[PDB]
Design a protein around this nucleic acid. Sequence first.
RNA 1: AGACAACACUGACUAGGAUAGCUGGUUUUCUGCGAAACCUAUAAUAGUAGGCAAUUUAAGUAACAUCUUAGUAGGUACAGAACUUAAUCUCAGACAAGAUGUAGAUUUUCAUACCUAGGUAUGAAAUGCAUUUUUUUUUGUAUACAUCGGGGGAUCGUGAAGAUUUUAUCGGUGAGUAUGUAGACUCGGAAUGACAAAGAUGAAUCUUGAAUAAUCAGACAUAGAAUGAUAAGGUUGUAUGUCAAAAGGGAAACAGCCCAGAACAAGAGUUAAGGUUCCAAAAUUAUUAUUAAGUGAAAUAAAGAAAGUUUUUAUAUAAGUCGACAAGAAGAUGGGCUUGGAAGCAGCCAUAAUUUAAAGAUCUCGUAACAGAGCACUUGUUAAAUCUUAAAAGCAU
RNA 2: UAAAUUGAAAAAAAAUUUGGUUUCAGAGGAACCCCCGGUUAAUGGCGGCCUUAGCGUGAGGGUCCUAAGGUAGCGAAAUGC
RNA 3: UAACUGUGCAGAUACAGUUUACCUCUAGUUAGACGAGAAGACCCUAUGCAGCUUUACUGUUACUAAUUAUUGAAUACGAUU
RNA 4: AAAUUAGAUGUAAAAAAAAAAUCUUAUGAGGGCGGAUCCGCUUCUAAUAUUUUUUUGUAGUUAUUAUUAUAAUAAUAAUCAUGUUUAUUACUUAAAAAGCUUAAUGGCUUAAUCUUGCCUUACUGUUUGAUUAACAACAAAUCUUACAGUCGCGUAAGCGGGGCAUAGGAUCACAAGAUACAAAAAGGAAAGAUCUUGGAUUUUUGGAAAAGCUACGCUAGGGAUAACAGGCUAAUUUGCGCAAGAGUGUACAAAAUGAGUGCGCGGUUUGGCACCUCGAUGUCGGCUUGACUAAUCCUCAUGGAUGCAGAAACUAUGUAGGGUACGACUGUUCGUCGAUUAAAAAGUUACAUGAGCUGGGUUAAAUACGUCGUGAGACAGUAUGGUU
RNA 5: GGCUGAGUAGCUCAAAGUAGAGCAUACCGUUCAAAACGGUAAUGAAUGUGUUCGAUCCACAGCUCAGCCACCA
Lengths: 168, 56
Amino acid sequence: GSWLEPNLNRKKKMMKGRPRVPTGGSTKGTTVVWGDYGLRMRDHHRRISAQQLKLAEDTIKQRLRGQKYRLYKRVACNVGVYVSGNEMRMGKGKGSFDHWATRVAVNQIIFEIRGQLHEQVIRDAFRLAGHKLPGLYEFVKKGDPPVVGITKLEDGLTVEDLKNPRKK
Amino acid sequence: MGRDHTIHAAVAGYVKYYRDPQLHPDRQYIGVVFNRNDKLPYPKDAPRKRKLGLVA
RNA sequence: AGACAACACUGACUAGGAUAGCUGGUUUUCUGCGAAACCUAUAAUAGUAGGCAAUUUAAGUAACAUCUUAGUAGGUACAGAACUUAAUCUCAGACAAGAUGUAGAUUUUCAUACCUAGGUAUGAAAUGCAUUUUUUUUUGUAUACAUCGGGGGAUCGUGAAGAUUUUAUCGGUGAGUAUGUAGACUCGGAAUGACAAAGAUGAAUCUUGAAUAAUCAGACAUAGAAUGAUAAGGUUGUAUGUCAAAAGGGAAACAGCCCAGAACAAGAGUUAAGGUUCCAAAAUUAUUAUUAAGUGAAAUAAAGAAAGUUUUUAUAUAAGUCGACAAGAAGAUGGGCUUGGAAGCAGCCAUAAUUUAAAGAUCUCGUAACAGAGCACUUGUUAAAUCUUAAAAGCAU
RNA sequence: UAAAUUGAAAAAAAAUUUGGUUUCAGAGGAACCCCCGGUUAAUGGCGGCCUUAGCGUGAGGGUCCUAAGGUAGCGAAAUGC
RNA sequence: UAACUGUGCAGAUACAGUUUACCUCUAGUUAGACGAGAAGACCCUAUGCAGCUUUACUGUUACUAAUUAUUGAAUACGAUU
RNA sequence: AAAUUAGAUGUAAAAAAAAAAUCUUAUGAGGGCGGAUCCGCUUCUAAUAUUUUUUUGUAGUUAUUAUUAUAAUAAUAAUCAUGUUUAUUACUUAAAAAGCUUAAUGGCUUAAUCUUGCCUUACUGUUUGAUUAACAACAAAUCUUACAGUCGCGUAAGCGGGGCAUAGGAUCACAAGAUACAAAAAGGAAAGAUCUUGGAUUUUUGGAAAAGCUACGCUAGGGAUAACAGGCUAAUUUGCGCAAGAGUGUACAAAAUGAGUGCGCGGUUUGGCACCUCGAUGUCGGCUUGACUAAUCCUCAUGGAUGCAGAAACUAUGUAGGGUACGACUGUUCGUCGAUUAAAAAGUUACAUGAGCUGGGUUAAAUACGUCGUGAGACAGUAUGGUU
RNA sequence: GGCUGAGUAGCUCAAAGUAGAGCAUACCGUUCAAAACGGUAAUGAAUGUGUUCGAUCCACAGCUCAGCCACCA
Ligand SMILES: [K+]
Ligand SMILES: [K+]
Ligand SMILES: [K+]
Ligand SMILES: [K+]
Ligand SMILES: [K+]
Ligand SMILES: [K+]
Ligand SMILES: [K+]
Ligand SMILES: [K+]
Ligand SMILES: [K+]
Ligand SMILES: [K+]
Ligand SMILES: [Mg+2]
Ligand SMILES: [Mg+2]
Ligand SMILES: [Mg+2]
Ligand SMILES: [Mg+2]
Ligand SMILES: [Mg+2]
Ligand SMILES: [Mg+2]
Ligand SMILES: [Mg+2]
Ligand SMILES: [Mg+2]
Ligand SMILES: [Mg+2]
Ligand SMILES: [Mg+2]
Ligand SMILES: [Mg+2]
Ligand SMILES: [Mg+2]
Ligand SMILES: [Mg+2]
Ligand SMILES: [Mg+2]
Ligand SMILES: [Mg+2]
Ligand SMILES: [Mg+2]
Ligand SMILES: [Mg+2]
Ligand SMILES: [Mg+2]
Ligand SMILES: [Mg+2]
Ligand SMILES: [Mg+2]
Ligand SMILES: [Mg+2]
Ligand SMILES: [Mg+2]
Ligand SMILES: [Mg+2]
Ligand SMILES: [Mg+2]
Ligand SMILES: [Mg+2]
Ligand SMILES: [Mg+2]
Ligand SMILES: [Mg+2]
Ligand SMILES: [Mg+2]
Ligand SMILES: [Mg+2]
Ligand SMILES: [Mg+2]
C-alpha cells in the first residue's frame, strides 16, 4: 500500500474515533527525526483526509520543482471514513466508505524535508502547504526540544517540572 | 473444578488467590483456608491443616 | 349516480338487548411518610403481569450507611511498540591471519655457490603502501551464511536463442532497544468504583412477618463515547446531580445551570451563591499594570493583515548608529552557447580569478539589439549623550 | 364381561367356544376429478439477439424461445414519463 | 386588554428591559387576538367498525352424483366362482 | 509452483563440608508469661527460601609433559556409563499455529491432545450448597455435594451421574413401558392418577389453524406521529465574503482573470430532527394594499485600468431618494420569446396579505384513457367537471 | 435514488468430479470458375479475491449491465 491508500479492506467499517490527546506527558511525534525541517500542527487535534494531504505534497513539489530535496511523510491515512447520505434520514445502519484519513495530535510533525536548498525556500513551501491544510501549522527545525501538550520543553524545562503540582 | 471450569469450595473456610511457583511456574490458583490469617501456598514441608468435620 | 325507499341509506325509521386496553370528569379539612418513567414477559410496544420497590406497624439486628487499617478480584485513562494492524525510515555487511603483486633500503637471519668459521656471490624473508576475504580457487572469529524476482542500461553473442554483469528503479525477504498508528494490540499501569473482615461513628436510614400501591412517553446540565456531518433543544448507552414532585436567592426575563431544601412571625441579626455609581439592599473601598477602541462592562465570531500601543528578551551607537543628501559603483569582457538580433538583465552551461575606497559573468526597470536610469556594495558631509534594528508576548484596530 | 369346556390343578393364570358389549377391516363399486377432443363478438394472451450493398442505411442472411408472437389501422393521442 | 427587542411548550396586550400614551364615544377598516363555527375528512394509532373483493381461514346454499325407503316382475347378456 | 522420506535448542549425570545473619513456617520442645491442644505477645530448636554472603574442598581413573628415585609429586586434557550406542535418564527448546464435534472467544501441552489395553457411571432413587438470591421477576435452565443400590478401570490412591468450555421450545392431546393408587350398588372393567420415554421452522420460537380494497367510508383517540408554516441545525443550495496564488493576460501574479483549497458570514433552497398546533395554524399562483433589508438593473459622486486617447464598457468604493414598464406562451412561481426603455435587478415579512377578493393548479365524491393488480381497486401518470 | 437477475469458442446456445453440440472459419476434393455439396481439422468458461480435496458452479467486491420499485399528503 501507500501512505494515502493503505492495504486495508473497505468493507470492514471503523468507528469515528478520536485523535490522541496525551495527558500524561507524552512527546510522541512532536520532533524532527529524519529531515532537517518540519511542519507542525500547533492549534488543535484533527482528522486530516487523504485528499488534503495529497494536495499538500503537490503544493510543496510545485514550489520546489527542479530542485534536490527529500520529502518525508510522518502520517499515514489508515482510518477509513464512512459517510451516510446527507439527504438520508437517521438510522438504517452505518454509512458507506467515503475516503481514507489520518488522526493527528496537537504539536505533531506532518512533513519533513532534507535537501541542499535555502531555508527561506523551504519556508515558502511549508507556508503554502499550511494555507491549504486544515488548521494552523508552524515551521520547525531539527534539534529543538519536543512539545508536551501545548508547552515546549525550552530553557531546561523537563516533563517532571510540568507534573510537579507546585509551579508558582 | 467443575465441568464448565467453575471453581467451587470443598470445605468451610476463606477464599485465597495466590500463585504456587513450586507446583507450576506460570499458574495462578484459588484456595480455601480454615483460618482467615493463613497464607497460601503452604510450605511443602508443613503438615496438612485439616478439620475433622464430624459430630459425635 | 352506491341513485332513491317521508331529519338518516356502501343499507331507513322505531322498540328491546352492548362494549369501549380510548378521551373527559371524580366534591371537606388537618397530620405523617413518600416514588417511577428501569429490568423481564406479553398478537406486545399509549395496555398488563411479575420484580426492583412507595406505604402501614410488629418482631429482629453480628441490620444498613460512612470512614479508618489490612486484604482480594479486574486491565480503563495513561503510557508504550513487546505480540497483532497500517504506513514510513535505516541497513543488508566487518576484522585478524594467510595468499597474490610492486617500487625499494641493501642491514640482519635463513637456504644454496662456495671460500677459508666469517667474508666473498646467488635467492628467499623481514620492513612501507597496494592487492585478495562473508561464501570465492581463503581459512578462522564474530553475526540473521546477511536477500529473491520484474524492469532499465551497458558489454558480448546466436540461424531465433540467452548469458553476465551493474543500478542509489518497483515488489518481496532478513535485521534494528528506529519513527508513528490502535473498538475487536496491552509487555507496563493508575485514580475512581466493587467485594468482604474488624473497629469506630451516625439522623433506624437495614432485614423479616403481616397488610398492600403506584410506575413501566421521561427531560436537561456536566464528563466520555456510538450514531449523524467532530450538526441539531438530534438519537442510543454509561457516570453524577437537579427537574419531574422543590418554593426561596443569583443567572435582566428562566422546569433541568450556581447556591440552598419553605411549619408560622420578629431582627439595620449571622451567612451561601452572587454582588456593592443610579434604577436597586451594599465600596464611586485600597494596591500595581494594561487599553483609548465605549473595545469592553453576565451568550469571547475565525484565519489573517498592519511604522496602533506597552512590556520583555536580543542588538546598533561620538570608532557618528538611523535617515537624508553628494560622488563612485571599474577592468580582462559584447563570458561561451543559442538567436534575425541575446552586449549583466529570453533561454541553456560555467561563474577557482583579477584589480580596487569598494563593484553579482548580475537583483528591479529600460533597448529590435546597444545605449541609459537604479540596487547590492564603497567614501564623504549633516547630526542623536536613556532616542538603532528585529523578534516574542499582552491589550487594541 | 358371563357361562361351559379345556388347561392349570402350586400362591395362578392362560387358551378355545357361545351370549352380550366394543373395535379393526375393504375385491367390487358414482359424479366432480384424471384422460381425449372442441370453442375467442368466452374470461384472456398476442417476443429477443447479432449480421450487412462502404461510412451510412439494412432489402438480404444468421440463430434462441413461445400456445401465438400486435395483423390492418391509428399514433407526443382524453393514451408520450 | 399599547409599541419594540429579547425571553419562554420554541410566533407575547399580560414575563424582562426600554419607549410611548389625557378620559370617553361615533362611522369606517380587517393586520392580530395562532379570530368564531364543526372533539381534523388528510396522516397515524385501536388485537375499534362497516361495505366490497379474491385461487385468505372456516362455513351455508343453488346445483350435480350414488343409494336404503315408498317398490313389484320377466326374460336375458354376463361376470364372480 | 505444488507428490515421498529424513532432519532442524542446549545442559547435566564421583562428591560436597562448615560459620553467622535476615525473615517466613511447625499437629516442634504438649516451651514460657497474660488471659497441652483457644488467642495476642513471646525466647529456643528444626525445616524451606533468601545475601554477591566468610570460606574450605574440587578428587579418583586413563593419558600426556616436566622434575625426582617402575614409583612419587606437580601441571594440562578427557571422564553420565558393568551398560545390547539406535544408549539411557533429568531438565530446556519464544510466540503463533495444529489438535480438542460444528462460528467466535478463552483455555489445555505437567492434559482437556494423541496411541493402546479393558470397558459402556451416556447408571437407578433421593439429596446438599451455589450461580454475591441464574436470565435486574416467575418458569423451562447451569455447575456442584452427600447417602443407598451395583458396575467398569486401576498395583494403589482413587476416578466415573457423557463429550475442553460457551448455541436443541413447554403444556395439552397422542403413543410405548412400568407403579397397584382409586374403581360412582357390588365383582371386574373402562376412563383417570404417579414414574420413565418417543414423534414439533407450536420459527410472531413463554407456544392463534388466518388474504386484500375503500377517493362512499364511519367511530373512539394522537401534536405520544407525517403533510403546510414557525423553532433548532447549517450537510447542501439557485446566497456571499476573506486569505493564499498554480495558471491565463504577446511582456508582466494581483487591469481583468483565479484550478484544486483553507478560514468564515448569512438564513433566501433541498434536507435532518419532531419542539409548538390534529375538542382544527386553510394551500401554489393571480389581484389589491403595503412595510423593511441592501449582497445595486438604471440615475448621482468617485479610485484602478502595458490592458483609462475620446466615446461606450469592465472592475471597485460610497449610496436604497425615486424608478425597475408593455405584450405573446404556460395554472404556473420560474423560464422562453416579441418590441420599447435611463434601466426594464433581487430578497424578507406564516415562501407578507383568502374573518381583503379570485379559484386556473394541487387534494374528495362522478367518468374515461394508459399502466399496475386474479379481483375489488390503485397510480410525484394524464384528462373533462366539481357549494370558497 | 433503492433492490433484484444475468456475463463461456468468431457467433449461438447447453452443462462443484464437465468444458459439449451446432453454425461460422481453415485445408483438400468436386466444377471451365464460383456457390451449394463431400471429406478431414482447429476454436472458450468475464474481473479479481475467498471457500472447497477440487469451483462454469458456492461466497464476496468491482466493470458491463438489463429489469423492477421511486406510494399517502
Ligand atoms: K391500549
Ligand atoms: K408533610
Ligand atoms: K419528607
Ligand atoms: K497487563
Ligand atoms: K458595547
Ligand atoms: K403549547
Ligand atoms: K382583523
Ligand atoms: K480408551
Ligand atoms: K363397580
Ligand atoms: K359545466
Ligand atoms: Mg490552513
Ligand atoms: Mg363509485
Ligand atoms: Mg347517497
Ligand atoms: Mg429516575
Ligand atoms: Mg402470543
Ligand atoms: Mg433530547
Ligand atoms: Mg425524543
Ligand atoms: Mg408525570
Ligand atoms: Mg427553584
Ligand atoms: Mg445585574
Ligand atoms: Mg447588617
Ligand atoms: Mg443605594
Ligand atoms: Mg551571455
Ligand atoms: Mg376401495
Ligand atoms: Mg373400477
Ligand atoms: Mg403495427
Ligand atoms: Mg417574541
Ligand atoms: Mg402584570
Ligand atoms: Mg368589512
Ligand atoms: Mg391571549
Ligand atoms: Mg476428546
Ligand atoms: Mg435473580
Ligand atoms: Mg415470544
Ligand atoms: Mg427467555
Ligand atoms: Mg376516484
Ligand atoms: Mg411533537
Ligand atoms: Mg483614473
Ligand atoms: Mg432628498
Ligand atoms: Mg403566503
Ligand atoms: Mg387573514
